[PDB]
């Protein structure tokens, strides 16, 4: 935020709309500057989030942060399979497995 205040930008219109919704939720305390309320949300780990399709904010503050996520060994390239006809078993003459 401090970067923004020095960079010559104030609070956004949409950040106010979300703050309106947030005080109805009891997330921020009514009667504080937008910076005071946004920091109150940021200490609950929530931020204002804009939908890239619309540009409008998400109607509420959303939890955002850095998480450690792994790519596991089960990958579709290994698992996708289909057969029209194919190999058969000796005695039963049914398709193989």
How many residues form the binding site for another protein (CB under 8 A)?
A: 35
Element (H or E) spanning 40, and its range? helix 34-42
Residues 38-67 that bind another protein (CB under 8 A): 47-56, 58, 62, 64, 67
Assess 97 for contact with another protein (CB under 8 A): no
Of 9, 28, 7, whose CA–CA distance to 18 is shortest?
A: 28
Of 39, 32, 37, 35, whose CA–CA distance to 19 is shortest?
A: 37
Residues that bind another protein (CB under 8 A): 4, 9-15, 17, 21, 47-56, 58, 62, 64, 67-72, 74-77, 79-80
């Amino acid at each position: 935020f401090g970067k923004r205040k020095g960079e010559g930008f104030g609070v956004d219109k949409r950040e106010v709309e979300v703050l309106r919704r947030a005080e109805k939720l009891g997330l921020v305390t009514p009667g504080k500057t937008p910076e005071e309320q946004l920091k109150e949300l940021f200490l609950q780990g929530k931020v204002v989030l804009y939908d890239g399709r619309t540009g409008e904010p998400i109607e509420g503050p959303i939890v955002v942060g850095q998480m450690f996520i792994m790519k596991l060994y089960h990958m579709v390239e290994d698992k996708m399979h289909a057969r029209s006809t194919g190999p058969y078993s000796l005695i039963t003459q049914q398709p193989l497995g």
